[PDB]
Amino acid sequence: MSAKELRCQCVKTTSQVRPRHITSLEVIKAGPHCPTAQLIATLKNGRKICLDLQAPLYKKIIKKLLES
Amino acid sequence: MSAKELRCQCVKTTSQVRPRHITSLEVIKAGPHCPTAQLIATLKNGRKICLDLQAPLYKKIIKKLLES
Amino acid sequence: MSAKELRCQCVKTTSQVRPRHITSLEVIKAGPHCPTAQLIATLKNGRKICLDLQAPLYKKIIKKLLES
Amino acid sequence: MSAKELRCQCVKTTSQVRPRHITSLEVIKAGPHCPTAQLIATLKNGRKICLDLQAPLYKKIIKKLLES
């Protein structure tokens, strides 16, 4: 009773990408297979990386979504 | 300024659902077919509705995700 | 006794788009709010339309994914 | 086919899960960061694993989606 078979969709934060031409991003909390916060993203060239949710980095993303 | 009536994955805000047992939600900005901010979500029972991003309602969601 | 307009993320089939530069597509069955088969898609320009799952149209999509 | 050291979303096929109470699954082809076919999925308990697209395993999924 806990999780069994652990597997986070994106390992570590994929901040290597910069926020700007992004398009949409998903944000999933820490499930069983993923006890760490797991948020993924999507760019203009329909591809997907992933970022964190405990810093001002993704806050610039959501803030960039509010500006419009 | 913007457009209207095209192909928004979710018409109007689906706030009829309350934030609590949710699981994850996507955040899409106003594209072409969707000049309105288009945010969709996902529940614990893998289903999906959609919320807004210009009020304190979704702020309770992201805030509920920061809690953990 | 369960079949009527509820909340399908995509009403009617969005076949107006042609399969070619697509990137990825979701395949959801007919849930409660969606008694109709609900398949959504994504293009190379991170956007999303939707197609059917009972014709040779989406079979050209999956077949296009098998070719590679 | 593969450049050098890329970033796939789901490593290896997550067939450890059996198809039955599933809810919906994504189908992404081999991008740049993912030269391998990258198909992800979703269960009834809004979670996400991933399967392959070159065997009869996912054919039981799509076939399970056609039956209804």
Curated annotation (Swiss-Prot), chains A, B, C, D:
Stated name of the protein: Platelet factor 4
Modified-residue entries (Phosphoserine), positions: 24
S-S pairs: 8-34, 10-50
Source organism superkingdom: Eukaryota
UniProt-annotated binding residues for heparin: 59-65
Record gene name: PF4
Organism phylogeny: Eukaryota, Metazoa, Chordata, Craniata, Vertebrata
